[PDB]
Amino acid sequence: AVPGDMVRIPGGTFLQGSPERTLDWLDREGQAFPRDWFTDETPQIPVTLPDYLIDRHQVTVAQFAAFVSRTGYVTSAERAGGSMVYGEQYWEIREGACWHRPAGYGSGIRGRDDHPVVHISFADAEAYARWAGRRLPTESEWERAATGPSYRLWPWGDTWDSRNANTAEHTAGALGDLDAWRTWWGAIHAVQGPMPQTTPVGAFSPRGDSVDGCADMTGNVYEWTSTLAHLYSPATRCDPTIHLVMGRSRVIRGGSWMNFRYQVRCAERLYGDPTGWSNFALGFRCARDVTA
């Protein structure tokens, strides 16, 4: 009895995190962030997991709607009156922004009910998962489902392909160069037109799927996990802003449509305030013990 919307990850021991040679590779790529933005993925540690279940797809708008319809659940963002959207330069609070007003008052989710739901706080995600008879993945369960039983940069392997997922690599490539992409970024925030640039769940299957069958483990939306931020070794050293959230934030995985290839790797780690905060690019999927 594996639910039809989940996949079974076979138990095993795997190397969580990134090897030093990957960080050396990042240092020599044309990308902005310093090495100590990636040392939180180090050192690799052996992690033993049993068989477990994980959702094939991120939770969709339609699915979250049915939860709200049947329970009356009110999300953190609705209680707070606003939620975060990315403007021309920085994250900004947008009044009325929530899962059903993704860009704030004056927007709606019309015709995107197969897209991942967004403006989900950590508590929203746990409430839904609980109602579904499930739970969030741990960080280890998430990475193992992304990279498969051996180390790879992205779920499909070590060679980048902008066609395999919803990331900014596709957009920048479509416009011809990063400069045109930067011009386009400006124009679409003057136009004020669209906001969240999500894609339907499973749109890039099978080519972008993980070896065990999970879709959109690269890009589209960020995903909550249940794991409290921690270093893989007590001696690991990262940017001080990373240390500042250790033991406090929960881990967020998979990058988003806004990211380029380096921030959508299987091992990439990100952290989010679990106390109610959310944004227009942050969703989740569920997992479950094999017997629960």
Binding site: W91, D239, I242, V245, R248, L270, Y271, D273, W277
Partner: peptide, 8 residues
């Protein structure tokens, strides 16, 4: 106050 997304 909120730490938002880290690293930013």
């Amino acid at each position: 106050h909120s730490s938002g997304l880290v690293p930013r």
